Design a protein around this ligand. Structure first.
Ligand code: NI
Lengths: 202, 202
């Protein structure tokens, strides 16, 4: 279910590659979850791209999340929304969007446990490595994993050279941006990471 | 109902004045509707300000709208959302937020008729005068008024000097930004406009 489909979590970055093409390649390569993350674009544009990503993810039986924007997630029938300290409070998103899966970006053990208490469905725990400027490291990531019962996706500076050490901490998934989106060959970059995920998680 | 509460429609602009302070003064001055219009702030901030303006508007029995953001409108229990060409499509907004009043920003007769057809509850028809920079003029405003059955609020370049001529096109209300938010005394500017509105519309 959710826990399994969070294993390889790929986030868009139009600074690096256009969303639709890059998501297609990531999905070809074995991404199990996609997050649309668009910093500054009109709502209509977010909606149109979101509709396309919702179709592609469905074609590959992948989960689809939108960063921040609950309106957009609702409008495109996304599986969920990712929420951080500058976003809609968890309890409020839950009220207005009771069927969305809520991911919470957390940067400390206190924040992890609080997000879980407020009803987050999974955590994005970071930043594991330098990339909020807070860096939790492998040690901090491991402590969050040990303390919470909801799924935990590691994030922050994760790539093929460190993915194994990250996955050894007990997380359910890794989230990547640059490692995939900034690659010369997006699909191959994703395949390399998915192999490591399969190797460590089983 | 809606039609009577659209008569003096005041829109925020933090480029001129902060929202909470200025909305209090406009409500004191007789604004009947307030629209929160914030560019480039975090969702958390939009939510916090929205909650305050929701409370304020209720205290003065004024309607409360949010520009663009259906998520924010839902989260703060606003009365409605205003939607333009770069925003969520009307039909989609109605699907995800079936209890919100929908205002449509329209800049032509075709846009007016299409928005009404799609189920807009009222129109923001403009720009009447120079202040999306499209200008429709008094004749274009009148034509819209003659052609649609839903309430029409005029917008764009409106002030105490041209407000009567605008009101004589048959609109249900006037929307102002600079005339009130750019005034030295926000309350007094709003009082003046409200009087003009009451005197023409009766
Ligand atoms: Ni390909």
């Amino acid at each position: 279910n959710l826990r399994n489909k969070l294993k390889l979590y790929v986030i868009t970055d139009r600074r690096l590659k256009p969303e639709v093409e890059s998501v297609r390649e990531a999905l070809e390569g074995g991404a199990t979850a996609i997050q649309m993350r668009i910093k500054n674009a009109p709502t209509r544009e977010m909606y149109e791209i979101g509709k396309t990503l919702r179709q592609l993810t469905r074609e590959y039986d992948a989960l689809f999340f939108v960063d921040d924007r609950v309106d957009v997630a609702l409008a495109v029938d996304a599986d969920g929304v990712q929420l951080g300290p500058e976003d809609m409070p968890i309890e409020v998103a839950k009220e207005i969007a009771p069927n969305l899966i809520i991911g919470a970006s957390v940067y400390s053990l206190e924040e992890a446990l609080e997000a879980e208490k407020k009803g987050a469905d999974y955590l994005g725990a970071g930043s594991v490595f330098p990339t909020d400027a807070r860096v939790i490291g492998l040690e901090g990531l491991r402590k969050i994993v040990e303390s919470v019962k909801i799924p935990v996706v590691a994030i922050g500076g994760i790539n093929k050279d460190n993915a194994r050490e990250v996955l050894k901490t007990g997380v359910d998934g890794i989230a990547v941006i640059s490692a995939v989106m900034g690659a010369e060959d997006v699909r191959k970059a994703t395949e390399e990471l998915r192999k490591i995920v399969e190797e460590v998680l089983g």
